Amino acid sequence: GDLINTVRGPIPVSEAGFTLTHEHICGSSAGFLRAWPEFFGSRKALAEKAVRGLRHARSAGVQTIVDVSTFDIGRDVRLLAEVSRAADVHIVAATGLWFDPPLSMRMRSVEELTQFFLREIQHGIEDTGIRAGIIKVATTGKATPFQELVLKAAARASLATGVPVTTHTSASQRDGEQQAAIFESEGLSPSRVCIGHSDDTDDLSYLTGLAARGYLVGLDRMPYSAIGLEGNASALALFGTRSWQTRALLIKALIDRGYKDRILVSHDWLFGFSSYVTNIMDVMDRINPDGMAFVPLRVIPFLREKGVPPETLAGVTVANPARFLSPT
Ligand SMILES: [Co+2]
């Protein structure tokens, strides 16, 4: 009877089922959806699009997503609850800080940040009573001084609550190694940590080094590719030039090296996106019309056809998220 908190309340761990561990309803900024909803057409249009997309994922077998939007990604837990209910897909919300914190966060101490993360896990987000079930943190290269405090505060909040920590990295810069060192300096167990965007690199020395230490490896950008769009500089910079099959081969590469229990798979998809160039959501929807159904529709069959046993795929998509999310 282990439980996880969702935007609709507590659920049994065993009901999470097929879980995408790094997703977003909307990638935005604090206050932005409230102040400028017309950027997304309207709030109603954004919610309707998210409901359609989540229903499509559900039809393809997805039962839960972890929306890793923090305060500074503009997380709107009321929107999450509305779309979760309408689409019948569980959504786990996040606390933490990504790489766009405002001054009122950047000026805070490790102790103050710990209190904020604990508020969102133990009390509730804003005035809603909805509790976060994961802590999201970020570096983009070597940690800034402030990011070091964020990572330490995340470790402290995790140790106090059992909730896991998940990260954004610049994978080509091997950020996960420094992240791990900071977390371990606070006594955090690697089994509570997912080093994300790890499919942005093919450096298996880096990835197996983390997996060997007990970290979860987040292969979470499966549909990201600018192949065919190389003349679009903004798409090229965000999506890269590696195909989805190349990204998916990393799942098999880690399985083949003994690390099936250390893999989490996701898309890093969204239904609105205001923190990048205007039009980016349209580019993305053309790349991947299947949205959050892409992993079950394309990635899982690709792996099965390469010989990965169904039981292993179920372990990656069901058992690993359940172990990760269960407070421990
Ligand atoms: Co990220």
Ligand SMILES: [Co+2]
């Ligand atoms: Co993300």
Ligand SMILES: [F-]
């Ligand atoms: F992301």
